[PDB]
Design a protein around this ligand. Structure first.
Ligand SMILES: *Cc1c(COP(=O)(O)O)cnc(C)c1O
Ligand SMILES: *Cc1c(COP(=O)(O)O)cnc(C)c1O
Ligand SMILES: *Cc1c(COP(=O)(O)O)cnc(C)c1O
Ligand SMILES: *Cc1c(COP(=O)(O)O)cnc(C)c1O
Lengths: 417, 419, 417, 419
């Protein structure tokens, strides 16, 4: 543990300062024997847990057979199979018609390829983004990202090409934030340049687990159709079954014009990403956008295996909704306890993307560091880090689930004397 | 092929010039479902400097998967990351006299350039970044300001890039004109148009730009210009690094020490997505969490990358073998260039190590040669601004047999097109 | 004529007022056609003392006769020293305003450009907060704070940068406080608002459609600005120089901005002219970071210093503007009364002699405005739709002409019906 | 008289260079309250090309005021507006055979440059604008992107400019080097770094930049380069216009006809803010109202501008008179320059017409001579990337007595400063 070598732009080796060894399911091991229940799961990257056996076999068998790893754009059997499976298993049973673009294997890369697409498809530079939205930190993505910490660090380069509307609930309760947006769309001097696209998370991740209301989602969708705006849904953290459906926008029965995916798309933790799009929007011309690792064949293999093993029927999906309910129940209890001790707290979320909003980052950091000492890995989000996220693996055993929540509850109580 | 055509976006390029379905890959040979077989002179655009699926790297990767090691470490500390950083220091940096620290952005070349220039801009409190004619450093909006190609910059959707100034690269202004004198003057000039730059980003041998090797005197002078004016020197070694030029770091040929180095492509050794930024230790200006990205701790790349460094770079045998093979290509590329000129069609050769280029006149003759080579079983791509430089990006590990075999297919293919 | 071929097709006031004008005095203009016209436009608030006021004419002609320097660059002239002393003795010191003067170029866009540049340098922040419907000029920098879409889309491929829009008072509806949304974003790390160096506002929005800000609203903004370390920039280019019944339109609320821009009626004679008022501590400029050739335009110095002494040496002018404003309000009300009881709803707004009749649509206001020109009244519109007919008559206007002008618009409205 | 120091911002620049109170001015002589009298070789940085308060224009102005003529016309047609478009077409454009229409922006040179490059971007549908080293074209944000001076560009408060690329101006790259070749190469290089411009903006003699006169060949090649690659030519005649170079338009020396022309400084002849944009009629892309400017119809400027075209440009007498005085200025400057060169301080004369410059070593010598000249009765300032160039910008109408008079104070001041 003498890593003087890594930069000072670290995050997770200051919060959880140990050397991790092996991993399976939701259990992680460290060099000193210690074992941890994982409610972080790589920030929503391990929706199927660490090193799932069916994925681990598919990947290994492919490596053993000397399947090409680095394909760039080239057709390969893995790529063909991936697109086959995604259309057969996911897209068609949900009535969705999309073509796939593969950009660089990162969320920010998908986001940059989606907004650039939208900009070219409509002839307009402006992207409407939402309060507390996170979408990545590359200069292009960064324009849609609201966090001052990232934005103040560019080095003298103001972002451009993006306008912020208030997300659902930002002005109170009941207050329609979309009506302000509707008025700005119709006001020539309002200050809102006509957007090529609205970009939205259905449940805001880094922004503090803020799940958009279904009627709100549906009205935004009609607002877009009525105003020649593509709806980009960023399903990079909320998707791949995290909110209890495969795509988080299923709950509202909307069909977004463009969808980005990344984190758990590969199932194993392999860097992977893509951008679904309605066919007619495929206005790209050959080679206008690229990225060395746009053809990561190993990610193709584990993604196909994950779709076939988990999304062939509704069983898994319905088991996430059910696991969500228990996390929801035990977070509400925790907010009740905190509230009655005179520290206001509340619960929100959707599926297994759930949040315990304590007062302030100082309280959340106490509850979190204590849970780490007690054997649970859980982390924060929100503008202040005041929301304790459940981002556990969707596959988590019931013992490991109730086992992690117990450790959380014990840690809250220990913090509260 | 009917699922791949109907469902993949039309932005694709490599499935267009190579319209077959690849399956197995080993060394410098690729297989297709139709029974065709290919010698790979493209190596994923220099991403597979050790060939496809190298035995030694494959076994290290499979062991790690079998033992259930953590794949996605986020940013936490793992044994794979320790072994990577220590291997990096002992095998690579220390014997080269290099004192750097390591920062891990997204597993992407653009992502590394973006962090690199963002770090330079905070270090110096200046926003402008000086770049050179024909440089490519990525397509995400931050990097694109330093990337020269109009086909990308015109597809931004109406956002003009911001933050970069373009300087004439070595040789751009004819022979025997030192382009750095122009640059040196603009720096001293209050109304000359150059916002004072935090950093200069450069490829020692330009990739997409047409295989342009900057001369050793030129590079050394640019290093001194950078110190004489408080500018950081960023060397983008994403393509020209990891052995491609005959030394690990391409800038070793000129004995300069940059302040910031970007690496990607061949860093993993296996075709796993990976990148790091190297900084002089004082430059560690970042505050915690100012930059991130989800696939930083990609541990599988830590294993393959550590494995490649110890296996190929624990001594200088491999180094010198690249040097010798680079010379084989230089010879056959020159001879090929003579053939083409003397048939009324001018051509030249340039490059360094196994980063070589055969400059035919125009992008249409080079397409004819490149496509003919594809029908004869050679995978070879063009670079340059018109598409006129046939580049050798064959694996550094290629066997003499497959190297001469690949160059044999090229020459036949060139003679074939002249008919 | 030669006025149709030689003149570029940008022109605005030569498709609505296509006669050739000759002699001009008070609120009366004479055409070549020989007809007279009553001017309820006053150069859109540039001629707050009417065309060619006798006192100013004389001070001007006397100055040209002695051969006083006309163009002094930056030089100290006697006319420059006089303007500063008069503004000091007659305007600033009696209101207890402590202000330095910076003279930019003689456009109004040039003053806003110098005001926001000053604010950014003072506060070390690039972002400027602007309001829905505001208008502050169309050069590329001032253009970033202007709301109008017809200007921002005509930049030819360059998006604006360094400005964010907040809802102006009332924009979100009845008895909703739009500054509560603004205060929340300031405290929200990721609400998407880069921390402003400055707010820039018109107390009554000119082009936006004659939108008077509430006095408590203005008072709360000033509170928010000091509490959050932001300069308050009041753009009094149109609503200034006694247009709202006080010399500074912010005098109604008792606040004191940090930076005040003036231009239109500053000369008092149609001379191009503008300045930036700034609290002394904010004088962060280094010698010569902002030039502009017609800096020291001594002809305007003469006419602006004469107008101040003549009209603003006491209370009388002030109060007769307030009275004339109440006349206009009584008729605009009676006219919105008429129009509504015929199924065409309308309303009156304003403050002082900056009032507007808000008829329903732009195309209806266009009939009335065009019809008024047929009956001998020049009157133009503003608003996002062109919705609002504005009263921007001179403040010196005689009661015969002010009544005469309103009788023409009253008739011209009836004819439209 | 110390309230001009208290009530005014410290942004002032010509308040510190000449700290007296000026009262009455006529011709090239300015009176002070101190009763001191000054010869003006500055004239509003070239804004009084017919001297201070020319009597003929003074009369035309006085009579329009006396008649209660409309001063602020916005955009409405008026007498004084029609007469200005008439006399411009009749006395100026047609005799020179030029087909131009007029946009009236706000009455500043920045506002003119902004309208022109904004218009150019709309006509060609491209955002980039090529400008040249040491170019100066205004300090509002849009014109600022084309301006070279760091001192203004560092003062924007964290906002980098956007939409402009810099090319080396004629002679920048040394003795006998055609900088335009570099330009043409970048125009055809897909990844050279230049976004394909909508237009090129240039001063035929660079004003603020240090009196750099582009050559006639060079200007003619740049016209050909623009017409070939589909680029408008804007010529920025704010300072070098209205006769200063020997011709009404400084581009007459080269016979080229630009697609866009900007005028402001001396355009009204009387020191009144005023500016127009000259375009070819087919370039009137504008839709109604897309560009604003309150003080566009400033009719008092129409009056004096027309009166000055009639009184000064009806024959070619005046225009050759200035060409004559340019040579007596040119002569003495070379004398003064050979003097300092022989006293061990190299210097040089350059210019064209009555835009002339004496280039000394540095700004500190410039400032010493400039300051001495003020004590001896001559108002003269500098320009250049360091203010190393003592610029002559006396009125074109200066009498021979005052022109040799001013030239004599300058010579006296240089020898005093030396020995
Ligand atoms: C390959 C290339 C890049 C691009 O990096 P990506 O991973 O493709 O985004 C950057 N720099 C150089 C020198 C390159 O050749
Ligand atoms: C995780 C997150 C990202 C981050 O993308 P990277 O792969 O880390 O660059 C982007 N968008 C959303 C919605 C996210 O939750
Ligand atoms: C008129 C207007 C401007 C623009 O001033 P110009 O002289 O036209 O450049 C600026 N601010 C306000 C409030 C305006 O009404
Ligand atoms: C003087 C100058 C300008 C500045 O115009 P202003 O009148 O100061 O607004 C613009 N372009 C050129 C070439 C100049 O010489």
């Amino acid at each position: 543990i003498l890593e003087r070598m890594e930069s000072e732009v670290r995050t997770y080796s200051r919060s959880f300062p140990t050397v991790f060894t092996e991993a399976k399911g939701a259990r992680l091991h460290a060099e000193d024997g210690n074992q941890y229940i994982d409610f972080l799961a790589g920030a929503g990257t391990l929706n199927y847990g660490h090193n799932h056996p069916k994925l681990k076999q598919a990947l290994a068998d492919y490596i053993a057979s000397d399947g090409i790893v680095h394909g760039l754009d080239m057709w390969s059997a893995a790529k063909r199979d991936y697109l086959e499976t995604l259309e057969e298993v996911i897209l068609k049973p949900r009535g969705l018609d999309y073509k796939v673009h593969l950009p660089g294997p990162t969320g920010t890369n998908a986001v940059e390829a989606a907004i650039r697409l939208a900009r070219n498809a409509k002839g307009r530079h402006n992207i409407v983004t939402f309060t507390n939205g996170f979408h990545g930190v590359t200069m292009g993505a960064l324009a849609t990202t609201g966090n001052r910490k990232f934005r103040e660090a560019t080095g003298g380069i103001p972002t451009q090409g993006a306008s912020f509307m208030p997300f659902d609930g930002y002005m109170g309760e009941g207050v329609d934030t979309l009506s302000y947006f509707e008025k700005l769309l119709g006001d020539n001097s309002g200050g809102l340049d006509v957007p090529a696209a609205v970009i939205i998370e259905t449940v805001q991740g880094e922004g503090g687990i803020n799940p958009a209301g279904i009627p709100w989602l549906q009205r935004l969708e009609k607002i877009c159709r009525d105003h020649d705006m593509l709806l980009i849904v960023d399903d990079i953290q909320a998707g791949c079954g995290r909110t209890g459906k495969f795509f988080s926008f299923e709950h509202a029965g909307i069909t977004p014009d463009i969808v980005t995916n990344s984190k758990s798309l590969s199932g194993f933790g392999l860097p992977f990403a893509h951008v679904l799009m309605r066919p007619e929007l495929d206005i790209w011309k050959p080679g206008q956008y690229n990225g060395t690792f746009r053809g990561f064949n190993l990610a193709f293999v584990t993604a196909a295996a994950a779709m076939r093993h988990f999304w062939s029927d509704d069983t898994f999906e319905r088991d996430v909704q059910r696991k969500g309910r228990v996390v929801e129940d035990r977070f509400q209890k925790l907010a009740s306890f905190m509230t009655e001790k005179g520290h206001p707290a509340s619960e929100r979320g959707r599926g297994l993307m759930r949040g315990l909003d304590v007062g302030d980052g100082d309280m959340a950091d106490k509850i979190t560091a204590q849970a780490f000492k007690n054997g649970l890995i859980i982390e924060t989000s929100g503008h202040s880090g005041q929301v304790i996220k459940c981002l556990c693996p969707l596959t988590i055993t019931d013992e490991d689930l109730v086992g992690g929540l117990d450790i959380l509850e014990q840690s809250v109580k220990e913090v509260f004397g």
